PDB file of all heavy atoms in Angstrom:
ATOM      1  N   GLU A  10     -94.027-107.028  81.107  1.00  0.00           N
ATOM      2  CA  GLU A  10     -93.108-106.942  82.293  1.00  0.00           C
ATOM      3  C   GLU A  10     -93.803-107.258  83.508  1.00  0.00           C
ATOM      4  O   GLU A  10     -94.979-106.945  83.791  1.00  0.00           O
ATOM      5  CB  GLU A  10     -92.515-105.547  82.378  1.00  0.00           C
ATOM      6  CG  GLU A  10     -93.510-104.435  82.563  1.00  0.00           C
ATOM      7  CD  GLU A  10     -92.943-103.102  83.080  1.00  0.00           C
ATOM      8  OE1 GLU A  10     -91.922-103.160  83.773  1.00  0.00           O
ATOM      9  OE2 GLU A  10     -93.514-102.043  82.886  1.00  0.00           O
ATOM     10  N   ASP A  11     -93.043-108.014  84.491  1.00  0.00           N
ATOM     11  CA  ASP A  11     -93.637-108.436  85.721  1.00  0.00           C
ATOM     12  C   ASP A  11     -92.801-107.965  86.829  1.00  0.00           C
ATOM     13  O   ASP A  11     -91.628-107.568  86.645  1.00  0.00           O
ATOM     14  CB  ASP A  11     -93.721-109.947  85.715  1.00  0.00           C
ATOM     15  CG  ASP A  11     -95.100-110.458  85.226  1.00  0.00           C
ATOM     16  OD1 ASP A  11     -95.204-110.617  83.974  1.00  0.00           O
ATOM     17  OD2 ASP A  11     -96.069-110.571  85.935  1.00  0.00           O
ATOM     18  N   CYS A  12     -93.317-108.018  88.040  1.00  0.00           N
ATOM     19  CA  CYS A  12     -92.548-107.639  89.242  1.00  0.00           C
ATOM     20  C   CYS A  12     -91.916-108.848  89.923  1.00  0.00           C
ATOM     21  O   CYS A  12     -90.677-108.979  89.984  1.00  0.00           O
ATOM     22  CB  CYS A  12     -93.540-106.911  90.205  1.00  0.00           C
ATOM     23  SG  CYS A  12     -92.670-105.880  91.403  1.00  0.00           S
ATOM     24  N   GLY A  13     -92.765-109.714  90.473  1.00  0.00           N
ATOM     25  CA  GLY A  13     -92.200-110.932  91.183  1.00  0.00           C
ATOM     26  C   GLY A  13     -93.225-112.060  91.155  1.00  0.00           C
ATOM     27  O   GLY A  13     -94.141-112.051  90.375  1.00  0.00           O
ATOM     28  N   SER A  14     -92.899-113.050  91.981  1.00  0.00           N
ATOM     29  CA  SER A  14     -93.777-114.220  92.086  1.00  0.00           C
ATOM     30  C   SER A  14     -95.181-113.825  92.516  1.00  0.00           C
ATOM     31  O   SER A  14     -95.481-113.715  93.704  1.00  0.00           O
ATOM     32  CB  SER A  14     -93.254-115.241  93.024  1.00  0.00           C
ATOM     33  OG  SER A  14     -91.808-115.282  93.016  1.00  0.00           O
ATOM     34  N   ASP A  15     -96.067-113.654  91.501  1.00  0.00           N
ATOM     35  CA  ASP A  15     -97.434-113.227  91.770  1.00  0.00           C
ATOM     36  C   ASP A  15     -97.528-111.887  92.479  1.00  0.00           C
ATOM     37  O   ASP A  15     -98.444-111.647  93.263  1.00  0.00           O
ATOM     38  CB  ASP A  15     -98.159-114.340  92.721  1.00  0.00           C
ATOM     39  CG  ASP A  15     -97.732-115.665  92.320  1.00  0.00           C
ATOM     40  OD1 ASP A  15     -98.057-116.205  91.225  1.00  0.00           O
ATOM     41  OD2 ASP A  15     -97.063-116.352  93.156  1.00  0.00           O
ATOM     42  N   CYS A  16     -96.593-111.025  92.180  1.00  0.00           N
ATOM     43  CA  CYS A  16     -96.510-109.741  92.774  1.00  0.00           C
ATOM     44  C   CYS A  16     -96.895-108.633  91.730  1.00  0.00           C
ATOM     45  O   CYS A  16     -96.840-108.889  90.551  1.00  0.00           O
ATOM     46  CB  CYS A  16     -95.114-109.430  93.298  1.00  0.00           C
ATOM     47  SG  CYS A  16     -94.287-110.881  94.050  1.00  0.00           S
ATOM     48  N   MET A  17     -97.315-107.480  92.207  1.00  0.00           N
ATOM     49  CA  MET A  17     -97.671-106.355  91.318  1.00  0.00           C
ATOM     50  C   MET A  17     -96.978-105.087  91.787  1.00  0.00           C
ATOM     51  O   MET A  17     -96.627-104.904  92.983  1.00  0.00           O
ATOM     52  CB  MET A  17     -99.178-106.166  91.326  1.00  0.00           C
ATOM     53  CG  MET A  17     -99.932-107.290  90.788  1.00  0.00           C
ATOM     54  SD  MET A  17    -101.518-106.853  90.053  1.00  0.00           S
ATOM     55  CE  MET A  17    -102.582-108.152  90.708  1.00  0.00           C
ATOM     56  N   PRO A  18     -96.731-104.171  90.822  1.00  0.00           N
ATOM     57  CA  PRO A  18     -96.165-102.835  91.004  1.00  0.00           C
ATOM     58  C   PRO A  18     -97.013-101.939  91.923  1.00  0.00           C
ATOM     59  O   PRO A  18     -98.093-101.572  91.528  1.00  0.00           O
ATOM     60  CB  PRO A  18     -96.002-102.303  89.624  1.00  0.00           C
ATOM     61  CG  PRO A  18     -97.049-102.899  88.866  1.00  0.00           C
ATOM     62  CD  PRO A  18     -97.220-104.244  89.368  1.00  0.00           C
ATOM     63  N   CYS A  19     -96.518-101.501  93.087  1.00  0.00           N
ATOM     64  CA  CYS A  19     -97.268-100.709  93.969  1.00  0.00           C
ATOM     65  C   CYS A  19     -96.362 -99.430  94.304  1.00  0.00           C
ATOM     66  O   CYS A  19     -95.689 -99.314  95.320  1.00  0.00           O
ATOM     67  CB  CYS A  19     -97.563-101.404  95.369  1.00  0.00           C
ATOM     68  SG  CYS A  19     -99.233-101.897  95.487  1.00  0.00           S
ATOM     69  N   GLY A  20     -96.453 -98.473  93.383  1.00  0.00           N
ATOM     70  CA  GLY A  20     -95.740 -97.192  93.584  1.00  0.00           C
ATOM     71  C   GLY A  20     -94.281 -97.403  93.819  1.00  0.00           C
ATOM     72  O   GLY A  20     -93.854 -97.121  94.882  1.00  0.00           O
ATOM     73  N   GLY A  21     -93.543 -97.975  92.840  1.00  0.00           N
ATOM     74  CA  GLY A  21     -92.149 -98.186  92.988  1.00  0.00           C
ATOM     75  C   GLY A  21     -91.959 -99.392  94.014  1.00  0.00           C
ATOM     76  O   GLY A  21     -90.786 -99.551  94.438  1.00  0.00           O
ATOM     77  N   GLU A  22     -92.950-100.131  94.347  1.00  0.00           N
ATOM     78  CA  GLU A  22     -92.831-101.248  95.288  1.00  0.00           C
ATOM     79  C   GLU A  22     -93.251-102.573  94.595  1.00  0.00           C
ATOM     80  O   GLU A  22     -93.486-102.616  93.408  1.00  0.00           O
ATOM     81  CB  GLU A  22     -93.640-101.010  96.492  1.00  0.00           C
ATOM     82  CG  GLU A  22     -93.501 -99.577  97.074  1.00  0.00           C
ATOM     83  CD  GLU A  22     -94.390 -99.334  98.345  1.00  0.00           C
ATOM     84  OE1 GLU A  22     -95.479 -99.960  98.413  1.00  0.00           O
ATOM     85  OE2 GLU A  22     -94.024 -98.507  99.140  1.00  0.00           O
ATOM     86  N   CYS A  23     -93.324-103.577  95.423  1.00  0.00           N
ATOM     87  CA  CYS A  23     -93.658-104.909  94.956  1.00  0.00           C
ATOM     88  C   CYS A  23     -94.514-105.645  95.990  1.00  0.00           C
ATOM     89  O   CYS A  23     -93.947-106.195  96.950  1.00  0.00           O
ATOM     90  CB  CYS A  23     -92.479-105.683  94.501  1.00  0.00           C
ATOM     91  SG  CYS A  23     -92.770-106.906  93.198  1.00  0.00           S
ATOM     92  N   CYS A  24     -95.833-105.785  95.776  1.00  0.00           N
ATOM     93  CA  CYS A  24     -96.720-106.428  96.760  1.00  0.00           C
ATOM     94  C   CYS A  24     -96.933-107.897  96.275  1.00  0.00           C
ATOM     95  O   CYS A  24     -97.569-108.184  95.258  1.00  0.00           O
ATOM     96  CB  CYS A  24     -98.032-105.758  96.881  1.00  0.00           C
ATOM     97  SG  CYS A  24     -98.924-106.175  98.431  1.00  0.00           S
ATOM     98  N   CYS A  25     -96.357-108.894  97.018  1.00  0.00           N
ATOM     99  CA  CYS A  25     -96.586-110.279  96.656  1.00  0.00           C
ATOM    100  C   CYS A  25     -97.575-110.965  97.620  1.00  0.00           C
ATOM    101  O   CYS A  25     -97.833-110.463  98.703  1.00  0.00           O
ATOM    102  CB  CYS A  25     -95.152-110.961  96.798  1.00  0.00           C
ATOM    103  SG  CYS A  25     -93.820-110.207  95.925  1.00  0.00           S
ATOM    104  N   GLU A  26     -98.141-112.010  97.116  1.00  0.00           N
ATOM    105  CA  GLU A  26     -99.193-112.782  97.855  1.00  0.00           C
ATOM    106  C   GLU A  26     -98.636-113.203  99.238  1.00  0.00           C
ATOM    107  O   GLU A  26     -97.352-113.329  99.445  1.00  0.00           O
ATOM    108  CB  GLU A  26     -99.653-113.964  97.116  1.00  0.00           C
ATOM    109  CG  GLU A  26    -100.907-113.699  96.320  1.00  0.00           C
ATOM    110  CD  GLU A  26    -102.054-114.741  96.692  1.00  0.00           C
ATOM    111  OE1 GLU A  26    -101.786-115.928  96.607  1.00  0.00           O
ATOM    112  OE2 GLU A  26    -103.174-114.316  96.966  1.00  0.00           O
ATOM    113  N   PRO A  27     -99.552-113.525 100.154  1.00  0.00           N
ATOM    114  CA  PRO A  27    -100.959-113.473  99.870  1.00  0.00           C
ATOM    115  C   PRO A  27    -101.528-111.985  99.798  1.00  0.00           C
ATOM    116  O   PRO A  27    -102.590-111.765  99.373  1.00  0.00           O
ATOM    117  CB  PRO A  27    -101.587-114.062 101.176  1.00  0.00           C
ATOM    118  CG  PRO A  27    -100.578-113.895 102.228  1.00  0.00           C
ATOM    119  CD  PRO A  27     -99.266-114.015 101.510  1.00  0.00           C
ATOM    120  N   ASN A  28    -100.576-111.001 100.138  1.00  0.00           N
ATOM    121  CA  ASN A  28    -100.963-109.604 100.087  1.00  0.00           C
ATOM    122  C   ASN A  28    -101.457-109.295  98.656  1.00  0.00           C
ATOM    123  O   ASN A  28    -101.434-110.137  97.761  1.00  0.00           O
ATOM    124  CB  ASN A  28     -99.665-108.772 100.379  1.00  0.00           C
ATOM    125  CG  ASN A  28     -98.942-109.322 101.559  1.00  0.00           C
ATOM    126  OD1 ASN A  28     -99.466-109.639 102.600  1.00  0.00           O
ATOM    127  ND2 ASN A  28     -97.600-109.500 101.338  1.00  0.00           N
ATOM    128  N   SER A  29    -101.916-107.988  98.514  1.00  0.00           N
ATOM    129  CA  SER A  29    -102.472-107.615  97.240  1.00  0.00           C
ATOM    130  C   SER A  29    -102.042-106.129  97.012  1.00  0.00           C
ATOM    131  O   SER A  29    -101.894-105.372  97.904  1.00  0.00           O
ATOM    132  CB  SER A  29    -103.982-107.747  97.203  1.00  0.00           C
ATOM    133  OG  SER A  29    -104.355-109.051  96.815  1.00  0.00           O
ATOM    134  N   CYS A  30    -101.903-105.805  95.719  1.00  0.00           N
ATOM    135  CA  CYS A  30    -101.614-104.462  95.289  1.00  0.00           C
ATOM    136  C   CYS A  30    -102.791-103.696  94.879  1.00  0.00           C
ATOM    137  O   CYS A  30    -103.184-103.632  93.698  1.00  0.00           O
ATOM    138  CB  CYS A  30    -100.520-104.473  94.191  1.00  0.00           C
ATOM    139  SG  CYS A  30     -99.759-102.846  93.755  1.00  0.00           S
ATOM    140  N   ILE A  31    -103.383-102.944  95.829  1.00  0.00           N
ATOM    141  CA  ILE A  31    -104.533-102.150  95.562  1.00  0.00           C
ATOM    142  C   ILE A  31    -104.366-100.699  96.126  1.00  0.00           C
ATOM    143  O   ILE A  31    -103.634-100.523  97.080  1.00  0.00           O
ATOM    144  CB  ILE A  31    -105.811-102.759  96.145  1.00  0.00           C
ATOM    145  CG1 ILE A  31    -105.806-104.245  95.884  1.00  0.00           C
ATOM    146  CG2 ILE A  31    -107.064-102.154  95.548  1.00  0.00           C
ATOM    147  CD1 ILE A  31    -105.977-104.620  94.434  1.00  0.00           C
ATOM    148  N   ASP A  32    -105.095 -99.763  95.502  1.00  0.00           N
ATOM    149  CA  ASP A  32    -105.002 -98.410  95.992  1.00  0.00           C
ATOM    150  C   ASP A  32    -103.617 -97.871  95.941  1.00  0.00           C
ATOM    151  O   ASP A  32    -103.276 -96.907  96.689  1.00  0.00           O
ATOM    152  CB  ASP A  32    -105.650 -98.276  97.451  1.00  0.00           C
ATOM    153  CG  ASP A  32    -106.143 -96.801  97.691  1.00  0.00           C
ATOM    154  OD1 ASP A  32    -107.016 -96.365  96.925  1.00  0.00           O
ATOM    155  OD2 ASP A  32    -105.724 -96.252  98.635  1.00  0.00           O
ATOM    156  N   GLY A  33    -102.793 -98.501  95.102  1.00  0.00           N
ATOM    157  CA  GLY A  33    -101.414 -98.061  95.049  1.00  0.00           C
ATOM    158  C   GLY A  33    -100.604 -98.515  96.278  1.00  0.00           C
ATOM    159  O   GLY A  33     -99.379 -98.124  96.368  1.00  0.00           O
ATOM    160  N   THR A  34    -101.239 -99.209  97.172  1.00  0.00           N
ATOM    161  CA  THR A  34    -100.572 -99.654  98.424  1.00  0.00           C
ATOM    162  C   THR A  34    -100.668-101.197  98.595  1.00  0.00           C
ATOM    163  O   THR A  34    -101.367-101.888  97.778  1.00  0.00           O
ATOM    164  CB  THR A  34    -101.173 -99.049  99.711  1.00  0.00           C
ATOM    165  OG1 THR A  34    -100.360 -99.319 100.803  1.00  0.00           O
ATOM    166  CG2 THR A  34    -102.565 -99.541  99.926  1.00  0.00           C
ATOM    167  N   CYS A  35     -99.884-101.742  99.542  1.00  0.00           N
ATOM    168  CA  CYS A  35     -99.852-103.204  99.760  1.00  0.00           C
ATOM    169  C   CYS A  35    -100.943-103.590 100.724  1.00  0.00           C
ATOM    170  O   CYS A  35    -100.766-103.421 101.984  1.00  0.00           O
ATOM    171  CB  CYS A  35     -98.491-103.592 100.268  1.00  0.00           C
ATOM    172  SG  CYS A  35     -98.165-105.393 100.051  1.00  0.00           S
ATOM    173  N   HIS A  36    -102.055-104.057 100.294  1.00  0.00           N
ATOM    174  CA  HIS A  36    -103.146-104.554 101.110  1.00  0.00           C
ATOM    175  C   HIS A  36    -102.916-105.883 101.745  1.00  0.00           C
ATOM    176  O   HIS A  36    -103.020-106.874 101.121  1.00  0.00           O
ATOM    177  CB  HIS A  36    -104.374-104.498 100.345  1.00  0.00           C
ATOM    178  CG  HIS A  36    -104.959-103.173 100.020  1.00  0.00           C
ATOM    179  ND1 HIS A  36    -106.252-102.758 100.405  1.00  0.00           N
ATOM    180  CD2 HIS A  36    -104.397-102.140  99.304  1.00  0.00           C
ATOM    181  CE1 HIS A  36    -106.434-101.549  99.864  1.00  0.00           C
ATOM    182  NE2 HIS A  36    -105.307-101.123  99.312  1.00  0.00           N
ATOM    183  N   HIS A  37    -102.421-105.886 103.008  1.00  0.00           N
ATOM    184  CA  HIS A  37    -102.116-107.150 103.668  1.00  0.00           C
ATOM    185  C   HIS A  37    -103.300-108.051 103.623  1.00  0.00           C
ATOM    186  O   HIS A  37    -104.386-107.639 103.301  1.00  0.00           O
ATOM    187  CB  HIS A  37    -101.773-106.811 105.131  1.00  0.00           C
ATOM    188  CG  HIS A  37    -102.681-105.903 105.825  1.00  0.00           C
ATOM    189  ND1 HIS A  37    -102.319-104.890 106.636  1.00  0.00           N
ATOM    190  CD2 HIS A  37    -104.051-105.787 105.824  1.00  0.00           C
ATOM    191  CE1 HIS A  37    -103.331-104.187 107.152  1.00  0.00           C
ATOM    192  NE2 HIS A  37    -104.406-104.745 106.619  1.00  0.00           N
ATOM    193  N   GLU A  38    -103.082-109.382 103.930  1.00  0.00           N
ATOM    194  CA  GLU A  38    -104.129-110.364 103.975  1.00  0.00           C
ATOM    195  C   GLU A  38    -104.135-111.122 105.298  1.00  0.00           C
ATOM    196  O   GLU A  38    -103.081-111.760 105.603  1.00  0.00           O
ATOM    197  CB  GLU A  38    -103.890-111.339 102.756  1.00  0.00           C
ATOM    198  CG  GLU A  38    -104.708-110.844 101.501  1.00  0.00           C
ATOM    199  CD  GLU A  38    -106.107-110.699 101.694  1.00  0.00           C
ATOM    200  OE1 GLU A  38    -106.833-111.681 102.079  1.00  0.00           O
ATOM    201  OE2 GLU A  38    -106.621-109.607 101.622  1.00  0.00           O
ATOM    202  N   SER A  39    -105.289-111.132 105.956  1.00  0.00           N
ATOM    203  CA  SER A  39    -105.344-111.826 107.227  1.00  0.00           C
ATOM    204  C   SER A  39    -105.998-113.261 106.961  1.00  0.00           C
ATOM    205  O   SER A  39    -106.286-113.598 105.853  1.00  0.00           O
ATOM    206  CB  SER A  39    -106.341-111.055 108.112  1.00  0.00           C
ATOM    207  OG  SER A  39    -106.227-111.477 109.427  1.00  0.00           O
ATOM    208  N   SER A  40    -106.094-113.986 108.097  1.00  0.00           N
ATOM    209  CA  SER A  40    -106.589-115.366 107.977  1.00  0.00           C
ATOM    210  C   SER A  40    -107.509-115.600 109.175  1.00  0.00           C
ATOM    211  O   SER A  40    -107.194-116.366 110.085  1.00  0.00           O
ATOM    212  CB  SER A  40    -105.486-116.369 107.952  1.00  0.00           C
ATOM    213  OG  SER A  40    -105.978-117.675 107.767  1.00  0.00           O
ATOM    214  N   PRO A  41    -108.675-115.058 109.092  1.00  0.00           N
ATOM    215  CA  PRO A  41    -109.671-115.205 110.226  1.00  0.00           C
ATOM    216  C   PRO A  41    -110.295-116.697 110.251  1.00  0.00           C
ATOM    217  O   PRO A  41    -111.076-117.085 109.386  1.00  0.00           O
ATOM    218  CB  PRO A  41    -110.774-114.243 109.858  1.00  0.00           C
ATOM    219  CG  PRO A  41    -110.668-113.967 108.460  1.00  0.00           C
ATOM    220  CD  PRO A  41    -109.202-114.164 108.118  1.00  0.00           C
ATOM    221  N   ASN A  42    -109.945-117.422 111.243  1.00  0.00           N
ATOM    222  CA  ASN A  42    -110.370-118.825 111.434  1.00  0.00           C
ATOM    223  C   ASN A  42    -110.467-119.219 112.884  1.00  0.00           C
ATOM    224  O   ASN A  42    -109.467-119.468 113.524  1.00  0.00           O
ATOM    225  CB  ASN A  42    -109.440-119.815 110.604  1.00  0.00           C
ATOM    226  CG  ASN A  42    -109.873-119.988 109.199  1.00  0.00           C
ATOM    227  OD1 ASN A  42    -111.075-119.894 108.884  1.00  0.00           O
ATOM    228  ND2 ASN A  42    -108.843-120.224 108.308  1.00  0.00           N
TER     229      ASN A  42
END
């Protein structure tokens, strides 16, 4: 079973890229340039 387009189950949620599903939460993703 899957959640979404490159997404993962985060405590009844769905973290999709570029974000990441870690620590049971949605770890946002920055772009330092």
